[PDB]
Amino acid sequence: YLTGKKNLVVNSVIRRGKARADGGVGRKTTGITKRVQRANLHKKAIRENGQVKTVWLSANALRTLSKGPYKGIE
RNA sequence: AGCUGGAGAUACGCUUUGACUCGGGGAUGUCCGAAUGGGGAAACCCACCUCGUAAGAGGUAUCCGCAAGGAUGGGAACUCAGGGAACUGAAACAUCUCAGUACCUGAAGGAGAAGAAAGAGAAUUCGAUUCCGUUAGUAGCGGCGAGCGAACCCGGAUCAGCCCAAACCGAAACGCUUGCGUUUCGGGGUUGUAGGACCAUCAAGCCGAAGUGGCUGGAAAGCUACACCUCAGAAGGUGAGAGUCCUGUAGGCGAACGAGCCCUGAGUAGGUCGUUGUUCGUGAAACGAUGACUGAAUCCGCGCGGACCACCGCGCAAGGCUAAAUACUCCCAGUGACCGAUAGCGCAUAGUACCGUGAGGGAAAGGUGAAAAGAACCCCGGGAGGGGAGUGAAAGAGAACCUGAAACCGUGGACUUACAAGCAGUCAUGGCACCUUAUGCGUGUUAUGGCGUGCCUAUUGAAGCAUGAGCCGGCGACUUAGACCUGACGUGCGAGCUUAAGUUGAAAAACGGAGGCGGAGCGAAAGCGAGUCCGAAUAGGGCGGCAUUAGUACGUCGGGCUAGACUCGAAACCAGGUGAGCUAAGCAUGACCAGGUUGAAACCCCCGGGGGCGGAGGACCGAACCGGUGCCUGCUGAAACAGUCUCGGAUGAGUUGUGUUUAGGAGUGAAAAGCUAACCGAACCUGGAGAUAGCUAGUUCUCCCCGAAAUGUAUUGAGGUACAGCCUCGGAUGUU
RNA sequence: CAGUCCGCGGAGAAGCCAUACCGGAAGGAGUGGUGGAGCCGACUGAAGUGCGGAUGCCGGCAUGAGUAACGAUAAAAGAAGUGAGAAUCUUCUUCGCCGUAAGGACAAGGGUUCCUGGGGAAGGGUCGUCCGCCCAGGGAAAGUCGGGACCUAAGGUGAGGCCGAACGGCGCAGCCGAUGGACAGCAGGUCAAGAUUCCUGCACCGAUCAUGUGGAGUGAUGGAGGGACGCAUUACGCUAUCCAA
RNA sequence: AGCCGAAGUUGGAAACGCGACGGUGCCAAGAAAAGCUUCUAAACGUUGAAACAUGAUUGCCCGUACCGCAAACCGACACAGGUGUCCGAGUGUCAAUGCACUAAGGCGCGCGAGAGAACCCUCGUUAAGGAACUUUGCAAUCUCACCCCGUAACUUCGGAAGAAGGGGUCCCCACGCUGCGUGGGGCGCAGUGAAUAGGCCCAGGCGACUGUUUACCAAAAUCACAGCACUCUGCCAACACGAACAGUGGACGUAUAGGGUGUGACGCCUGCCCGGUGCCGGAAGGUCAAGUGGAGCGGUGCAAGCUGCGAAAUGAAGCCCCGGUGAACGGCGGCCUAAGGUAGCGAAAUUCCUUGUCGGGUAAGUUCCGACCUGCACGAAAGGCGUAACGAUCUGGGCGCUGUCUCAACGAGGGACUCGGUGAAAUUGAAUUGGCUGUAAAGAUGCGGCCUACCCGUAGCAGGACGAAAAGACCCCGUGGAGCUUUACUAUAGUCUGGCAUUGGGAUUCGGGUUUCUAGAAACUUGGAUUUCUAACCUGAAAAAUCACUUUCGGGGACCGUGCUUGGCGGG
RNA sequence: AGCGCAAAGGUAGAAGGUGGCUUGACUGCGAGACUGACACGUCGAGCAGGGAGGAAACUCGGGCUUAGUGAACCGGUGGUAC
Ligand SMILES: [Mg+2]
Ligand SMILES: [Mg+2]
Ligand SMILES: [Mg+2]
Ligand SMILES: [Mg+2]
Ligand SMILES: [Mg+2]
Ligand SMILES: [Mg+2]
Ligand SMILES: [Mg+2]
Ligand SMILES: [Mg+2]
Ligand SMILES: [Mg+2]
Ligand SMILES: [Mg+2]
Ligand SMILES: [Mg+2]
Ligand SMILES: [Mg+2]
Ligand SMILES: [Mg+2]
Ligand SMILES: [Mg+2]
Ligand SMILES: [Mg+2]
Ligand SMILES: [Mg+2]
Ligand SMILES: [Mg+2]
Ligand SMILES: [Mg+2]
Ligand SMILES: [Mg+2]
Ligand SMILES: [Mg+2]
Ligand SMILES: [Mg+2]
Ligand SMILES: [Mg+2]
Ligand SMILES: [Mg+2]
Ligand SMILES: [Mg+2]
Ligand SMILES: [Mg+2]
Ligand SMILES: [Mg+2]
Ligand SMILES: [Mg+2]
Ligand SMILES: [Mg+2]
Ligand SMILES: [Mg+2]
Ligand SMILES: [Mg+2]
Ligand SMILES: [Mg+2]
Ligand SMILES: [Mg+2]
Ligand SMILES: [Mg+2]
Ligand SMILES: [Mg+2]
Ligand SMILES: [Mg+2]
Ligand SMILES: [Mg+2]
Ligand SMILES: [Mg+2]
Ligand SMILES: [Mg+2]
Ligand SMILES: [Mg+2]
Ligand SMILES: [Mg+2]
Ligand SMILES: [Mg+2]
Ligand SMILES: [Mg+2]
Ligand SMILES: [Mg+2]
Ligand SMILES: [Mg+2]
Ligand SMILES: [Mg+2]
Ligand SMILES: [Mg+2]
Ligand SMILES: [Mg+2]
Ligand SMILES: [Mg+2]
Ligand SMILES: [Mg+2]
Ligand SMILES: [Mg+2]
Ligand SMILES: [Mg+2]
Ligand SMILES: [Mg+2]
Ligand SMILES: [Mg+2]
Ligand SMILES: [Mg+2]
Ligand SMILES: [Mg+2]
Ligand SMILES: [Mg+2]
Ligand SMILES: [Mg+2]
Ligand SMILES: [Mg+2]
Ligand SMILES: [Mg+2]
Ligand SMILES: [Mg+2]
Ligand SMILES: [Mg+2]
Ligand SMILES: [Mg+2]
Ligand SMILES: [Mg+2]
Ligand SMILES: [Mg+2]
Ligand SMILES: [Mg+2]
Ligand SMILES: [Mg+2]
Ligand SMILES: [Mg+2]
Ligand SMILES: [Mg+2]
Ligand SMILES: [Mg+2]
Ligand SMILES: [Mg+2]
Ligand SMILES: [Mg+2]
Ligand SMILES: [Mg+2]
Ligand SMILES: [Mg+2]
Ligand SMILES: [Mg+2]
Ligand SMILES: [Mg+2]
Ligand SMILES: [Mg+2]
Ligand SMILES: [Mg+2]
Ligand SMILES: [Mg+2]
Ligand SMILES: [Mg+2]
Ligand SMILES: [Mg+2]
Ligand SMILES: [Mg+2]
Ligand SMILES: [Mg+2]
Ligand SMILES: [Mg+2]
Ligand SMILES: [Mg+2]
Ligand SMILES: [Mg+2]
Ligand SMILES: [Mg+2]
Ligand SMILES: [Mg+2]
Ligand SMILES: [Mg+2]
Ligand SMILES: [Mg+2]
Ligand SMILES: [Mg+2]
Ligand SMILES: [Mg+2]
Ligand SMILES: [Mg+2]
Ligand SMILES: [Mg+2]
Ligand SMILES: [Mg+2]
Ligand SMILES: [Mg+2]
Ligand SMILES: [Mg+2]
Ligand SMILES: [Mg+2]
Ligand SMILES: [Mg+2]
Ligand SMILES: [Mg+2]
Ligand SMILES: [Mg+2]
Ligand SMILES: [Mg+2]
Ligand SMILES: [Mg+2]
Ligand SMILES: [Mg+2]
Ligand SMILES: [Mg+2]
Ligand SMILES: [Mg+2]
Ligand SMILES: [Mg+2]
Ligand SMILES: [Mg+2]
Ligand SMILES: [Mg+2]
Ligand SMILES: [Mg+2]
Ligand SMILES: [Mg+2]
Ligand SMILES: [Mg+2]
Ligand SMILES: [Mg+2]
Ligand SMILES: [Mg+2]
Ligand SMILES: [Mg+2]
Ligand SMILES: [Mg+2]
Ligand SMILES: [Mg+2]
Ligand SMILES: [Mg+2]
Ligand SMILES: [Mg+2]
Ligand SMILES: [Mg+2]
Ligand SMILES: [Mg+2]
Ligand SMILES: [Mg+2]
Ligand SMILES: [Mg+2]
Ligand SMILES: [Mg+2]
Ligand SMILES: [Mg+2]
Ligand SMILES: [Mg+2]
Ligand SMILES: [Mg+2]
Ligand SMILES: [Mg+2]
Ligand SMILES: [Mg+2]
Ligand SMILES: [Mg+2]
Ligand SMILES: [Mg+2]
Ligand SMILES: [Mg+2]
Ligand SMILES: [Mg+2]
Ligand SMILES: [Mg+2]
Ligand SMILES: [Mg+2]
Ligand SMILES: [Mg+2]
Ligand SMILES: [Mg+2]
Ligand SMILES: [Mg+2]
Ligand SMILES: [Mg+2]
Ligand SMILES: [Mg+2]
Ligand SMILES: [Mg+2]
Ligand SMILES: [Mg+2]
Ligand SMILES: [Mg+2]
Ligand SMILES: [Mg+2]
């Protein structure tokens, strides 16, 4: 489970292979030939709180952690 | 005052110092199971620690926390959430739909969710959330196709908003060059018409009014002659139909214990890239929502008003809690133009029997009689079965016990039949029999004469040698839904007509105008308006006048739509499971292969050759065993793949046990698409699911009237559809 | 089926059964016969409302028909018994059939099928007095055999630990897990039915304690050895066991 | 044994069992763990040890009946099927678990009795002939064990080989040797006297071979095989299973190894053609995404400003382009294409015309064999030509013998038939069910005429009932389905690539930024680029196997791995 | 004979041939009919604004006629100001 500690998340979306796009450029107005679902996540770090451990930590959570401890220390 | 479970059976007994039975608590409560001392193939194995006499009792899992003390699992449907189908429609099919449906998984409760505006919205209104009606199929989305589809206003059901961070005091512990600031505790402080600081009853139950004589009968509750009670004539039982026999009902009481109302939230608002929700499919695409990278502002401040800007309005996000109206119905009561033994739940009980290795599938159901009085006794028979006798109203009820239809099997009697050719009959005549709707224009039968291609379906055409069908019974197919559209008929009111949600009553229905339809049309729309669009003015289209054709709320019915949509019927597709106990291989570990034949190296002598010696081999022959080569038999089998005989191997790439691992687009395969539990070019089960079916078959009571078509054009069309053509019903017209 | 009337009914309802009667048809009456407890007629309302068909469904009964067969061509025959009844059950004497089996012992796996006494519906491809069927009652004995209170292979688990939308997927030690390692008795007897279990004879094992010798060193979840392993052939002795006189 | 209890000898045979964990040879190199024996650590003591002897005491749980190659298990059954392990006597026969008889033990298979038709199944003998039968000698003969003698073309020298072919086989006696051999006699038709117990030869095709396969219509020429070849892969290897920086397999292997592909022992060999396609190199130039850039074109405001578009240049892989590669996909012909067939073979498993022509073999040869070549439409590792040996392989021939046949006959048994007991099935519109000829949907019992036919059975046959069975698997149709294919379309796991994050100091060349100063350079970078560094990270060694600690530590290294996004490749 | 291409009709007072002028190869309309199931299609007098030729009557909203063509959706370009 990729739960990135404080603001844990794992997302999925559907994604669209759009054809020869013009849109407001011209008549070719994206035929949409692809409808398939995707996923994504994030990587790993190590931290301390109460007594030190190590946990997956969002890089955005690392950016918050370089500004000061938040509930748990770096 | 009986009790001693169903259970119907005997014996043993308990009870008026209160049994039983009913309500309420207590106390015991073996083992499995979240199972939790440890193991494990549930319900069984093996321990340790304190009590310590012993029999016996208590503790010994993990997660959160010092510590109390929580948690694990289960629950029919309902809720929220993390994932997320495919048939299907689109008459093909990708976007689309089917659908956030089915399904899986998580959390939880009697509900849940959501909820106290950085909102809807366009009146400078509204003031939490949920739910119904409506707005409304309006807006809108859509290969702008099939189709998908809001919200506000308004009307109801229910309506409660409450709490913390933060500026500031008191620290206290700790942090630094010296009356100061990181997270902890009390005070205080909770906002937008900006707020705030600091300075001026129901449970178990009891009581409960009132009828007797005669008659029929086996029996009284029926009939009948006189009565009585009624705050009670709801109902059920009693030998049949009971206000007055019972139990009850109306009414009334009813308990020790019993349940139940200077600050105002940043790694964030915002942005780019990928995406998505509401009607939102990149569309001009705002807004929320998050994966990645970034990254503001403070009250002369921030977000929104659907690209974007100014103005003008709505509102203060990045902290939390919050009943009720709402959903379901495992369970209880009540009720029914609901069923009544093929119906109704699968079950008048049973998730049993039975089928399956499994997941899982899955039945038939019934009836003495009032009461057992359930047939003493005798007869034939081992019986079984039966005949008497009795019981009983009935034994024309006797336990294969209500009725007891049809197929189908028999016994007896009338008429008939052994040179006849035959869809089983139809009319006629004669012969015989009989006379209970019945001496006749008779009933049963019959001889001869004439006549005469089963039924349905599908068809140009059916006796067909075209389909279906053994026969009788019984189940078995044009339905339901909706504030839908359209027509016919009927009714109320009528230039007006009517409610929906709900509210109050219910042995009964009234209120409820939000809202819908008529009243004006033309236009692409702004917009004009009996006129209007086209246009530079005149020519037209739709429209009113005129015939002002009257509408609307219901009911019934004909059609239409949407949804299984007249019933049955696919081969398939998808989801989550169940299966390697068959078979396909692997692994671990054990075991098995009579006997006989041949005689490799190597080693040792005589000159690569001879001798010895030795005992090798995917060597030879042949039993077990493993395997199936050819004929035959078997072919409703002895057997859902065999048997006799014959044949392949038979120390190797061998056979075989146990245990075990590998599976569904997946496994395994010395490779046939072979095997994966007896139908494998994608198992099985449950489900989606009544998939779709332009294809087939089937669609039952009667009579009256009318009466077709197989043509034309169009079509991923030709065996199918659309529009004409032809039929019919009604209205008008009025001889066309 | 429902509402409302009219009524009927143990001197007998519906239902069932005949029937020459009646309406234009779907149909409906009269009378008789079962039946034995509810029901007709009229008006209205609602429907799961009218069957010959669907290789339709549940059910019963036909035809084929007293036909094919009676499940290995290892044959059976006489006496005698029992008995309601015997080609078949019991016994006797011949006969024939298997004999690396068609004998015996185990494992599975089945679960009372075992033994005794009884029974005769149905199951037994005929019969049946019999049975592996029905009824009732007995039989099943372990310190040493197999397993467990020991061990480990594959495999499965698995505190910690590594991962992963969820459920979960892995995963060191340890643990489970026999098909393997380890380990103490044999000979005999016998219920109707048990046997290295019970009884008889005489052994072994471990454990506790006592008496004594000895009269002091024991000596771990750690080290070490060992347990510890293939195939084909093959020499020597021997037993089981069988042959001869 | 026996009528309570006798005897228990001599000779021989002999296990897979015991001694044993024996010897020897081989290569494919053959569990773990506790019990057990021996050591100390800690601890307990060293005048109530370890051990031994005797006595006593203790000995828990579960299983054990019966069936158990089958009437009691798996096959819906009292089922001809299967079912793992152990023991399984004797006579004879070289041997044996074989064959025949039989001990022990066990059983006659749960309808019987007649009869001796057709027909059918398993069988015995058969005149004369002998394959004439037929697709084919399919089937059934024939051959048959042991011993002696004798055996070809060919050969990889091992084999073909049991080649072929001939001879013996029994009983008695004497003699020799360790039951054999030597002589003699004897009996029959006959001497492995009964049972088990190879037919053989010549010549092809295909495959070398043993082997493997479509449970249940195909066992082969299919598949695999050693051998060969290409090609990849430097070790967290390529490669595969996988939500996964998890973990595994490859592999406790490391280029003499591992993966894939195709040929398929051995022998002689394996030619031509890089044009397309693939791939491997190159990478002057063409084109190519996001991103960097934002010159300009517009809105909207009085304006500050906000905001919609938006070029040029610069942007990777990749494709176009240029070489090459064939034991890569392939091509090697039609009165210009990249070339046009090197050897070898050829009427083929490939030959249409086709029974090609000639020869061979038979009286007669569409077959077959050998030559020829006019190869419709051979050919070199989708291998070409051979090959000994091998084959339940296919084809042609010949010997041998046969009821396959001319041509069937007689006999046996199990049915079939008759009687008694039990007693089904597929089917079935209903049947009072004829012949001809005509007619009708065009194949008449059923319509027309004409003929024939008393009622009913029973044993038989197989023409009719378009008989029976499975709503034709062939064909067509359905805007049905599914499996498979590819340069059909679309996506997409996977995979390559640029940029952003994890992700950092620094030197070193900097197209450039600012305040810095006599066109200029120190403080300094925003970056890019090589190069280098060790705190991020990855990885490995040490009593602490996976993991965490520390590491005198060791290596890589801001890459690799992972997150987002870009563009390509992508029948898996 | 000819009539731009295929043929049928038609045509000698021209539709054939040859010059002058110019664009009616117009905008807005459409009475009436033909034809088609629809949907499309054909012919069309005359009115407006304004042109062109002719001295005028008059003739011009394409070619002697019949073929020279594709609804609908989605978009490009110019106007317009809903
Ligand atoms: Mg989602
Ligand atoms: Mg009772
Ligand atoms: Mg437990
Ligand atoms: Mg447990
Ligand atoms: Mg469709
Ligand atoms: Mg589809
Ligand atoms: Mg659901
Ligand atoms: Mg759920
Ligand atoms: Mg829960
Ligand atoms: Mg009276
Ligand atoms: Mg009553
Ligand atoms: Mg976006
Ligand atoms: Mg679109
Ligand atoms: Mg029922
Ligand atoms: Mg019934
Ligand atoms: Mg049920
Ligand atoms: Mg049962
Ligand atoms: Mg009886
Ligand atoms: Mg009676
Ligand atoms: Mg009766
Ligand atoms: Mg009875
Ligand atoms: Mg009754
Ligand atoms: Mg009855
Ligand atoms: Mg006569
Ligand atoms: Mg006749
Ligand atoms: Mg007819
Ligand atoms: Mg026809
Ligand atoms: Mg027919
Ligand atoms: Mg039929
Ligand atoms: Mg509604
Ligand atoms: Mg009306
Ligand atoms: Mg008008
Ligand atoms: Mg109506
Ligand atoms: Mg109608
Ligand atoms: Mg309609
Ligand atoms: Mg269906
Ligand atoms: Mg061999
Ligand atoms: Mg040989
Ligand atoms: Mg096989
Ligand atoms: Mg052979
Ligand atoms: Mg499936
Ligand atoms: Mg696949
Ligand atoms: Mg199968
Ligand atoms: Mg569906
Ligand atoms: Mg048609
Ligand atoms: Mg029509
Ligand atoms: Mg007219
Ligand atoms: Mg009566
Ligand atoms: Mg009647
Ligand atoms: Mg009665
Ligand atoms: Mg009734
Ligand atoms: Mg019905
Ligand atoms: Mg019909
Ligand atoms: Mg029927
Ligand atoms: Mg039936
Ligand atoms: Mg017969
Ligand atoms: Mg018979
Ligand atoms: Mg038989
Ligand atoms: Mg006898
Ligand atoms: Mg006698
Ligand atoms: Mg007697
Ligand atoms: Mg009897
Ligand atoms: Mg006697
Ligand atoms: Mg046996
Ligand atoms: Mg057992
Ligand atoms: Mg017995
Ligand atoms: Mg007995
Ligand atoms: Mg009996
Ligand atoms: Mg019987
Ligand atoms: Mg017997
Ligand atoms: Mg025991
Ligand atoms: Mg003992
Ligand atoms: Mg043991
Ligand atoms: Mg695991
Ligand atoms: Mg084990
Ligand atoms: Mg064992
Ligand atoms: Mg032992
Ligand atoms: Mg005794
Ligand atoms: Mg015994
Ligand atoms: Mg051996
Ligand atoms: Mg003697
Ligand atoms: Mg053995
Ligand atoms: Mg251990
Ligand atoms: Mg026993
Ligand atoms: Mg037992
Ligand atoms: Mg069977
Ligand atoms: Mg059997
Ligand atoms: Mg033996
Ligand atoms: Mg023997
Ligand atoms: Mg012998
Ligand atoms: Mg034998
Ligand atoms: Mg036996
Ligand atoms: Mg017998
Ligand atoms: Mg025979
Ligand atoms: Mg002969
Ligand atoms: Mg001869
Ligand atoms: Mg012939
Ligand atoms: Mg032949
Ligand atoms: Mg053949
Ligand atoms: Mg043969
Ligand atoms: Mg030679
Ligand atoms: Mg030789
Ligand atoms: Mg020979
Ligand atoms: Mg002689
Ligand atoms: Mg002789
Ligand atoms: Mg002999
Ligand atoms: Mg013989
Ligand atoms: Mg071969
Ligand atoms: Mg062989
Ligand atoms: Mg086969
Ligand atoms: Mg075969
Ligand atoms: Mg790793
Ligand atoms: Mg090959
Ligand atoms: Mg030839
Ligand atoms: Mg040939
Ligand atoms: Mg060849
Ligand atoms: Mg010739
Ligand atoms: Mg030839
Ligand atoms: Mg080649
Ligand atoms: Mg080859
Ligand atoms: Mg050979
Ligand atoms: Mg072979
Ligand atoms: Mg031959
Ligand atoms: Mg004969
Ligand atoms: Mg005979
Ligand atoms: Mg008989
Ligand atoms: Mg009988
Ligand atoms: Mg004719
Ligand atoms: Mg005809
Ligand atoms: Mg006739
Ligand atoms: Mg007739
Ligand atoms: Mg026959
Ligand atoms: Mg069909
Ligand atoms: Mg078909
Ligand atoms: Mg298709
Ligand atoms: Mg990808
Ligand atoms: Mg892309
Ligand atoms: Mg495909
Ligand atoms: Mg002219
Ligand atoms: Mg005009
Ligand atoms: Mg004019
Ligand atoms: Mg003029
Ligand atoms: Mg424009």
Side-chain angles (χ1 to χ4, degrees), chain A residues 46 49 57 65 68-70 72-74:
Chain A
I46 158 170
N49 151 84
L57 223 27
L65 270 192
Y70 188 88
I73 147 86
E74 170 273 312

Side-chain angles (χ1 to χ4, degrees), chain A residues 2-7 9-15 17-26 29-33 35-46 49-72:
Chain A
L2 272 292
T3 47
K5 256 309 174 170
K6 222 305 124 180
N7 268 271
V9 66
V10 175
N11 202 345
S12 110
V13 317
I14 99 176
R15 57 93 173 248
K18 314 231 166 195
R20 339 215 180 83
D22 297 319
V25 179
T29 18
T30 90
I32 330 300
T33 47
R35 152 238 191 171
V36 326
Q37 273 85 293
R38 201 215 241 72
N40 68 77
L41 34 109
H42 176 71
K43 75 152 53 60
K44 178 174 157 185
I46 158 170
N49 151 84
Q51 189 43 221
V52 326
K53 14 174 195 167
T54 172
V55 267
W56 277 310
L57 223 27
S58 333
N60 148 256
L62 312 181
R63 289 176 58 208
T64 294
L65 270 192
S66 307
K67 319 299 167 284
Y70 188 88
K71 282 143 190 168

